[PDB]
Amino acid sequence: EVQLVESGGGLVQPGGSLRLSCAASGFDSGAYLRHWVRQAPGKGLEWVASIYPSYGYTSYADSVKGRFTISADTSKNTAYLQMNSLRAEDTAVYYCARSAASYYGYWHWYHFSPGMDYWGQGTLVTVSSASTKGPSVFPLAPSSKGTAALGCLVKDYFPEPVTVSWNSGALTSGVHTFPAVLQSSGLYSLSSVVTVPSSSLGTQTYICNVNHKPSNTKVDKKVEPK
């Protein structure tokens, strides 16, 4: 019935600082090693820092040495990870984890250390020197005549969370909304496509609704054969 709750994340442009936090619940923080492990979007797992809160022992990965400060509060049962002089490629989801024990194990037999039984669920940290901009949405309009396909192109929007549905929740079967990829411009770009019978053109209306909560922006583009 124990849990890890991790907070702090958000957007900050490179060179700034952004402190993380990890509330621990249900177990004794001072008899369990605490580690911060991050995962860049679509990349693997990369360890960041580790602490033995009781004795204060600290350990970092050399990709980040000299910038991050891992810390713990025994009274508040919460472990911190001060991220300083943040770099552009630090963008990842930062996880908080647990390990077992042993002053003896730490010093002498550290390799034979048991696993990370409980992790939190994550806090997202994005670093970019780019203002938040709503997406400009562009139609795709098929000219192909059986079953043809059409879609939208939402491009040049910051930050990530963008949602696409078709005909206000109607078109579900065949909806293929891709995952966004951030362009060289620093802004993300995305495309949604759907499969429909060739008969549907000239009969059915097709409109994608794209909401961008961070910019407080909703856009609708009707897609019609040219």
Partner: protein, 210 residues
């Protein structure tokens, strides 16, 4: 930092004996842990070292190559698996590169569509021609971009779905971001798809710009 995991993106179906291998960091018989990461969820632990020991997940230690041989494969397990070690040096923790298991099905060929950029876009000042590989199985596919019969490189971007809940197939989004000026300087634009399903590279194209 980068541990070597021998399968990178290998796929099988439910009820299959699958083995994943990990290269070690230092040399000394160390401790090993493995994690399951389902998409958009936090990783969870499976097994540990020394005494490795449900019925399916089992770890084995061969020389410098640690293994996670899962025997009875259930649909709940299709996920990504990571290998992690503790190194008694800098008190550092190092992970494997991750290995994903996607479902295995018969072979499906892409439904290839090409869309020239919208007029609403080129007045703004950028042209984004997009190609659509639609529901296909093998996930391995080459999408070559030919403007005026010249395979342009260093401008396209790719995007893939994970897998459809019904057919367990993929889709690809090649997006070419050419400037408005450099878009209208050429006429024929083509998208070339090389994939295992199709017998010969299938290309769909259009003709506008000059």
């Amino acid at each position: 930092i980068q541990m070597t995991q021998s399968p990178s993106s290998l796929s099988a179906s439910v009820g299959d004996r699958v083995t994943i291998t990990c290269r070690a960091s230092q040399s000394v018989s160390s401790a090993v842990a493995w994690y399951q990461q389902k998409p958009g969820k936090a990783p969870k632990l499976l097994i540990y070292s020394a005494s490795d020991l449900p019925s399916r997940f089992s770890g084995s230690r061969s020389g410098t190559d640690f293994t996670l041989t899962i025997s009875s494969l259930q649909p709940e397990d299709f996920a990504t698996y990571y290998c992690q070690q503790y190194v008694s040096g800098g008190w550092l923790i190092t992970f494997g590169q991750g290995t994903k298991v996607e479902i295995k099905r018969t072979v499906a060929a892409p439904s290839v569509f090409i869309f020239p950029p919208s007029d609403e876009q080129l007045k703004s000042g950028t042209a984004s021609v997009v190609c659509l590989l639609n529901n296909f199985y093998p996930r391995e596919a080459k999408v070559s971009w030919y403007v005026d019969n010249a395979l342009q490189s260093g401008n396209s971007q790719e995007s893939v779905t994970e897998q459809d809940s019904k057919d367990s197939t993929y889709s690809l989004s090649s997006t070419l971001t050419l400037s408005k000026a450099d878009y209208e300087k050429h006429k024929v634009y083509a998208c070339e798809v090389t994939h295992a399903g199709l017998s010969s590279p299938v290309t769909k194209s259009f003709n506008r710009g000059e």
